Design an enzyme around this catalytic site. Structure first.
Site, mmCIF file in Angstrom:
data_model
loop_
_atom_site.group_PDB
_atom_site.id
_atom_site.type_symbol
_atom_site.label_atom_id
_atom_site.label_comp_id
_atom_site.label_asym_id
_atom_site.label_seq_id
_atom_site.Cartn_x
_atom_site.Cartn_y
_atom_site.Cartn_z
ATOM 1 N N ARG A 192 4.495 -6.312 -9.675
ATOM 2 C CA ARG A 192 4.780 -7.913 -9.298
ATOM 3 C C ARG A 192 3.389 -8.294 -8.812
ATOM 4 O O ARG A 192 2.628 -7.799 -7.959
ATOM 5 C CB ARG A 192 5.705 -7.659 -8.209
ATOM 6 C CG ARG A 192 6.075 -9.238 -7.700
ATOM 7 C CD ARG A 192 7.280 -9.505 -6.839
ATOM 8 N NE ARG A 192 7.323 -8.580 -5.761
ATOM 9 C CZ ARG A 192 8.264 -8.889 -4.705
ATOM 10 N NH1 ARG A 192 9.454 -9.725 -4.921
ATOM 11 N NH2 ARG A 192 8.077 -8.067 -3.592
ATOM 12 N N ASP A 196 13.975 -14.775 -0.539
ATOM 13 C CA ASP A 196 12.991 -15.866 -0.658
ATOM 14 C C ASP A 196 13.875 -17.096 -0.759
ATOM 15 O O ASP A 196 13.658 -18.079 -0.391
ATOM 16 C CB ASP A 196 12.166 -15.435 -1.743
ATOM 17 C CG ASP A 196 10.749 -15.177 -1.441
ATOM 18 O OD1 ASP A 196 10.072 -14.122 -1.979
ATOM 19 O OD2 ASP A 196 10.034 -15.689 -0.356
ATOM 20 N N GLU A 223 14.127 -17.343 -7.067
ATOM 21 C CA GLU A 223 14.087 -17.344 -5.659
ATOM 22 C C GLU A 223 13.558 -18.530 -4.816
ATOM 23 O O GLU A 223 13.215 -18.302 -3.887
ATOM 24 C CB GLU A 223 13.258 -16.123 -5.098
ATOM 25 C CG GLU A 223 11.706 -16.295 -5.649
ATOM 26 C CD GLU A 223 11.105 -14.739 -5.164
ATOM 27 O OE1 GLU A 223 9.862 -14.477 -5.907
ATOM 28 O OE2 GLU A 223 11.505 -13.944 -4.568
ATOM 29 N N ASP A 269 10.136 -7.555 5.085
ATOM 30 C CA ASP A 269 9.033 -8.004 4.094
ATOM 31 C C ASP A 269 8.850 -9.348 4.221
ATOM 32 O O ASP A 269 9.359 -10.106 5.145
ATOM 33 C CB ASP A 269 9.412 -7.628 2.637
ATOM 34 C CG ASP A 269 10.524 -8.689 2.036
ATOM 35 O OD1 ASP A 269 11.306 -9.190 2.985
ATOM 36 O OD2 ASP A 269 10.496 -9.281 0.947
HETATM 37 MG MG LIG Z 1 11.134 -12.793 -3.128
#
Ligand SMILES: [Mg+2]
Length: 701
Positions: free
Chosen positions: A322, A440, A412, A611
């Protein structure tokens, strides 16, 4: 300075050296051509990259104003400003050269911080995991009286694990008659699996579920089975600790778990300079070359087919990487003026180069010749097309066939959700998945409608009309685009790392919703989530959903505004302390120790994986409540100072209390909340990177 001049670029030496000495050797790519390519790509695409970011700001400014100054009116408005674009014509994706793990196999998708070599290796090896260990070590098997975990093996608990798995086998690979619970032995005869029972012997209801075995057919060391495209391997050894106690000598039940893993450079890691990026790139390189060692990567697994021939199954998870999104820049490279280069562009160039090694036998990741890159935080079809062009230019620089670099599209951000079909179409020949990054997405939901009014509590977001519509809409668009059999339709992460009993009982909703994959936080969670794909026939679920349109544009646009007199004093207090606890626990480890992912207990003491996305939500929610008078600046300060000491307790750690204002980490936490409304689309990186670099600077002097 300690930089290297290549055209208009000044590359940090550590990055320059890493690439020439580690990444380039073995790719046939001459360094001079590579760097010239980097220079050319950065120069050519940076203007468009900036333009896209300016578009986001422009749209958000108009929306903030609209609210400060009726669904039909709102929708009409979003259309006029180019936020909500026309639905493109129906189409089917054309992405080719994709591995079976993505196009056909439905199963767990693990995510891991790429800067942590140990974690990354464990995750890559998570392709196979012990069900016994996952059941025994977690609460899936309740620690009721007599079945609790002690320093040594609890026979009673072990028996529960055994029975649990026996039931799993019965439900997944049914016997013609009887159950595995009564099995006494296993043999392979006439390429057929024969399970010995007390009264008689029996084969499989579906003989086709027998995929192989190890050892002599007359007394196999293991029996390999397959259900819904996923393997289950029963290990046999009457002498093992567990085996000696089992009726058939069964030692364990191994499940193909993490079919694919996402080595993450984004939200789960803290990389604010060339030095950090290099640590990440090097681990990514080691994974692709197969020589990363912290433990090492497992070799592939060998079996004998029921018919006699020998075959091998991947002993590793197929890896995606990612990259960071279009927002941030990183001084790993700066131009003549000292302007930082866009990080996303660099990630495409570097992780792409490195990925080439995973396309060749280690001295293999993808056998079909594809490089799988997850591109997060994109807003709309133009940003998706920009990513595709970036990849196209990188392939050119790397001398790779066009379309080699495939894209895992994160759904997201709101502007992507409401224009999802168009986003998929922009990448019709490169997309390997779409995934509802709900964290997100929730963060963006709050920031986009920041000026609309007070939002509902963070926990309430998980069940709001907008998100349920968002989840079904993502599935509908993917299936309508022909994803079934071609690309993954994925869903979010389970962040309560220790609540495995709850995950097993409820995460089944995702495959039931037609998702061919979903995110898990660990190898254990991957093995437990795998269970769901044995219970749910995703391929069949998707076939049954094909053609259905279950979400309207109105539902998607239903802003999570809180109703009048919605909360009580104690409820507002709890929400603030919880969000501050989550923000402080995560940020202190981010800023002081460079850890982008930590387990932080919430106000209920439940271990939550934190996160940047979880952070974006917490900070944006509080910024939103502060913005609309729900809480005061004193409330925020008091919560931060109340929760700070607890976080110091839970934890090379530098206490934030008592002198909070002397702590860069504490200051970052406070900044994320108080300046949250002003951050671009509510993104946390600008503040996090600045504070982390500040800390490093202070620590250096
Ligand atoms: Mg995300």
């Amino acid at each position: 300075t300690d930089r290297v001049s290549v055209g208009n670029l000044r590359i940090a030496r550590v990055l320059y050296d890493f690439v020439n000495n580690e990444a380039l050797p073995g790719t046939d790519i001459d360094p001079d051509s590579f760097w010239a390519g980097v220079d050319k790509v950065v120069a050519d695409l940076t203007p468009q990259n900036q333009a896209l970011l300016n578009a986001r700001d422009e749209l958000q400014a108009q929306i903030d104003k609209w609210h400060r100054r009726d669904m039909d009116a709102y929708r009409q408005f979003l259309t006029e400003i180019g936020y909500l674009l026309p639905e493109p014509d129906d189409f089917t994706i054309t992405t080719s050269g994709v591995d079976a793990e993505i196009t056909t196999t439905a199963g767990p998708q693990l995510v891991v911080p790429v800067l942590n070599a140990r974690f990354a290796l464990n995750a890559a090896n998570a392709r196979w995991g012990s069900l016994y260990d996952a059941l025994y070590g977690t609460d899936v098997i309740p620690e009721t009286d007599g079945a609790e975990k002690g320093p040594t093996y609890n026979k009673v608990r072990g028996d529960k694990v055994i029975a649990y798995a026996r039931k799993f086998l019965d439900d997944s690979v049914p016997l013609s008659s009887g159950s595995f619970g009564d099995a006494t032995g296993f043999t392979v005869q006439d390429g057929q699996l024969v399970v010995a029972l007390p009264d008689k012997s029996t084969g499989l209801a579906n003989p086709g579920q027998f995929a192989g075995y190890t050892g002599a057919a007359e007394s196999p060391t293991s029996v390999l089975l397959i259900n819904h495209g996923l393997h289950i391997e029963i290990l046999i050894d009457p002498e093992s600790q567990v085996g000696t106690t089992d009726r058939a000598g069964v030692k364990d039940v191994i499940l193909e778990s993490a079919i694919t893993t996402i080595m993450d450079f984004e939200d789960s890691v803290a990389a604010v300079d060339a030095a950090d990026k290099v640590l990440g790139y090097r681990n990514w390189l080691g994974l692709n070359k197969g020589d990363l060692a912290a433990r090492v990567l497992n070799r592939d697994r060998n079996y004998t087919a029921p018919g006699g021939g020998q075959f091998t199954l991947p002993g590793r998870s197929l890896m995606f990487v990612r990259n960071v999104g279009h927002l941030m820049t990183n001084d790993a490279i700066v131009d003549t003026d000292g302007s930082e280069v866009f990080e996303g562009i660099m990630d495409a160039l570097f992780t792409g180069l490195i990925a080439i090694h995973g396309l060749k036998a280690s001295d293999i990741n993808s056998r079909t010749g594809s490089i799988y890159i997850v591109k997060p935080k994109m807003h709309g079809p133009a940003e998706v097309a920009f990513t595709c062009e970036l990849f196209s230019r990188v392939e050119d620089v790397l001398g790779l066939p066009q379309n080699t670099m495939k894209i895992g599209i994160m759904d997201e951000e709101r502007r992507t959700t409401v224009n999802l079909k168009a986003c998929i179409k922009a990448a019709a020949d490169r997309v390997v998945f779409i995934n509802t990054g709900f964290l997100d997405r929730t963060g963006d939901e709050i920031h986009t409608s920041m000026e609309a009014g007070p939002m509902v509590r963070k926990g309430t977001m998980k069940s709001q009309p907008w998100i349920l519509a968002y989840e079904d809409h993502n599935v509908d668009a993917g299936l309508a685009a022909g994803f079934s059999g071609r690309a993954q339709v994925g869903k979010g992460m389970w962040t309560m790392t220790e609540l495995m009993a709850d995950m097993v009982e409820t995460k089944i909703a995702q495959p039931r919703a037609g998702a061919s994959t979903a995110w898990v936080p660990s190898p254990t969670a991957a093995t437990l989530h795998a269970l769901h794909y044995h219970q749910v026939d995703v391929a069949a679920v998707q076939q049954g959903l094909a053609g259905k349109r279950r979400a309207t544009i109105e539902q998607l646009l239903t802003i999570p505004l809180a109703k009048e007199l919605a909360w009580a004093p104690d409820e507002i207090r709890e929400e603030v302390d919880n969000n501050c606890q989550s923000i402080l626990g995560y940020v202190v480890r981010w800023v002081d120790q460079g850890v982008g992912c930590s387990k932080v207990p919430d106000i209920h003491d439940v271990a939550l994986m934190e996160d940047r996305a979880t952070l974006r939500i917490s900070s944006q929610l509080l910024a939103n409540w502060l913005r609309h008078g729900v809480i005061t600046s004193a409330d925020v300060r008091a919560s931060l100072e109340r929760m700070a000491p607890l976080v110091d307790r839970q934890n090379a750690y530098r206490p934030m209390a008592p002198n909070f204002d002397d702590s860069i980490a504490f200051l970052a936490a406070q900044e994320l909340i108080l300046s949250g409304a002003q951050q671009p689309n509510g993104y946390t990186e600008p503040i996090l990177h600045r504070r982390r670099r500040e800390f490093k600077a202070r620590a250096a002097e």
